[PDB]
């Protein structure tokens, strides 16, 4: 039985990756590359829409729109859930990581009031497993996970210390179907790491929920995809694992029929998913 809808949101702030950055890491990029910063290179790049890294708006874009709501998009490409990136070469220049996200929406209010009827939209984590497995990370996945979950929780209790009480907080995404953790052979490794995020967050938002009267909703997206995966054909989908844009280890022209293709390039959904995705996390709310 369906639990009563959320009251309407005006305003997001969305903090998290390349799920739901709407052109900062394009931004901060082009301004990387303008001040001769070492190591610096034009993100997303050109087989990317409009800055977002996929082809099409991110779920927390369709989310704003479903909801009715103005969207401040924070998210960065290659966040991680601490200070810094998947991207080494951006440390030197900004902390583009959630807890640097969090420090600018701050510091960019004055000691201002953050807005209570806002919601604050937390996706982040995949690039903590990333990172790891690219470089040859020495801490157990198990450690990984609750490094990643003790700094989603950090960053939920300073943005509520500052005023915020509204929240979305989302699940590791199925990192385990990503094409670049298949051709990786880290299957098991993924539904290690990703299985641990989620079964402790959650018992982290019920600590956070007995403070300030915050309301934590989460967002299952393990659940979500496992359904529409099940279900392909109901939703339109046809391919669930090859790049519509493939870029590993070069790039090659894009498929025909991208709205029936779960993936976009080897690690990011198609806009047909975020799509999905924005409409499932909106079901919450009111308009
Ligand atoms: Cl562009």
Redesign the pocket.
């Known amino acids: 039985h369906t639990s009563p809808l959320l009251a309407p949101v005006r305003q997001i702030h969305a903090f998290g990756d390349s799920y739901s950055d709407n052109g900062e890491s394009?931004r901060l990029t082009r301004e990387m590359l303008a001040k001769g910063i070492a190591g610096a290179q034009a993100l997303p790049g050109?087989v990317?829409?409009?800055?977002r890294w996929s082809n099409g708006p991110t779920a927390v874009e369709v989310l704003a729109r479903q909801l009715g709501a103005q969207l401040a998009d924070h998210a960065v490409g290659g966040a991680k859930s601490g200070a810094d990136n998947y991207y080494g070469w951006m440390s030197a220049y900004r902390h583009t990581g959630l807890a640097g996200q969090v420090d600018a929406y701050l510091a960019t209010l004055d000691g201002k009031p953050v807005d209570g009827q806002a919601l604050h939209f937390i996706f982040v984590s995949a690039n903590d497993f990333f990172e790891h497995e690219d470089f040859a990370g020495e801490q157990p996945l198990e450690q990984l996970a609750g490094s990643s979950v003790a700094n989603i929780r950090a960053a939920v209790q300073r943005l509520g210390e500052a005023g915020a009480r509204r929240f979305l907080v989302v699940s590791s995404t199925d990192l385990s179907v990503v094409p670049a953790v298949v051709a990786g052979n880290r299957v098991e490794r993924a539904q290690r790491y990703l299985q641990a995020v989620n079964a402790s967050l959650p018992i982290q938002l019920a600590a956070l929920r007995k403070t300030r009267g915050l309301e934590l909703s989460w967002f299952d997206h393990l659940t979500f995809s496992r359904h529409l995966r099940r279900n392909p054909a109901r939703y339109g989908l046809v391919e669930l694992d090859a790049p519509c844009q493939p870029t590993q280890p070069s790039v090659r022209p894009a498929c025909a029929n991208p709205d029936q293709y779960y993936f976009w390039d080897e690690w990011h959904p198609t806009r047909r998913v975020h799509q999905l995705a924005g409409e499932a996390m909106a079901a919450r709310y009111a308009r």
Not at 48 to 51: D, E, I, K, S, T
């Open positions: 394009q050109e990317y829409w409009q800055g």
